[PDB]
Structure formats: structure tokens, C-alpha cells
Design a protein around this ligand. Structure first.
Ligand SMILES: COC(=O)c1c(N)[nH]c2ccccc12
Ligand SMILES: [Zn+2]
Length: 113
């Protein structure tokens, strides 16, 4: 019904940048694996298991192409990314544990703004 106000777009980018730039206690950038999806050639099981594949690259593109109409819309996709990581990977694994932290980082970034 109307274009995204520049204020909303700036917020979406500010929230996602907080998530992407987040470095843990050891000083490790947790988002590293999630920026890009795995290769269809090396990990075909992933594409067999995961209904809606989404990475941080696609999220940035959807903010850019005004695909998210609200912060709740952006949240649904960030929650999807993490759910996907947790669906494919073993509980307790580095990827699995990282997605749980990034869910928390997003919520903390959103709740601030
Ligand atoms: C086995 O690796 C994964 O689970 C993921 C990967 N390589 N890139 C992603 C982007 C988003 C969610 C999960 C993943
Ligand atoms: Zn599910």
C-alpha cells in the first residue's frame, strides 16, 4: 500500500549489521557461516531437508528490494535462517550453537530500536 519509510530501511540495516558484526567472548564472528548458503554440489542433503533456504546475503537483498514491510517481517526471516541451521545441524555443534546466539543478538538489536 505504500513505500518503506527511509527510517525503517535504516533500522533493518542497523539491526542486521549488529547481528553480522557480532563477535563472541573468544572474539569469533558467529555470522561467518550464515552469510552464504552451502553449495548444492557438496551438501545436496541440505537442499533435500530445508524447505525455504535463506542466508544473510538474501536477507540484505530483501531489505534492499523492500521485501520486508515491518521489523516483524525481517524477524520471521532471521528466525527462519536460525531454524534451518538448527534443523540440519546436530544439537551441540558449532553451527547449531551459533544460530541460537544470533537469535538472541537479533532480538537484543530489535528491542533496543
Ligand atoms: C551446514 O551448513 C549450514 O547449516 C549452513 C551454511 N553452510 N550456510 C547457512 C546459511 C544459513 C543457515 C544455515 C547454513
Ligand atoms: Zn520447521
Amino acid at each position: 500500500l505504500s513505500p518503506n519509510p527511509p527510517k525503517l530501511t535504516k533500522q533493518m540495516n542497523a539491526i542486521i549489521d549488529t547481528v553480522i558484526n557480532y563477535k563472541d567472548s573468544s572474539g569469533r564472528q558467529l555470522s561467518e557461516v550464515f552469510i552464504q548458503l552451502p553449495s548444492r554440489k557438496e551438501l545436496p542433503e541440505y537442499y533435500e531437508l530445508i524447505r525455504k533456504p535463506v542466508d544473510f546475503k538474501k536477507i540484505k537483498e530483501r531489505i534492499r528490494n523492500h521485501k520486508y514491510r515491518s521489523l516483524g517481517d525481517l524477524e520471521k526471516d532471521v528466525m527462519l535462517l536460525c531454524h534451518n541451521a538448527q534443523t540440519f545441524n546436530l544439537e551441540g555443534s558449532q553451527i547449531y550453537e551459533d544460530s541460537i546466539v544470533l537469535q538472541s543478538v537479533f532480538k537484543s538489536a530489535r528491542q533496543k530500536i
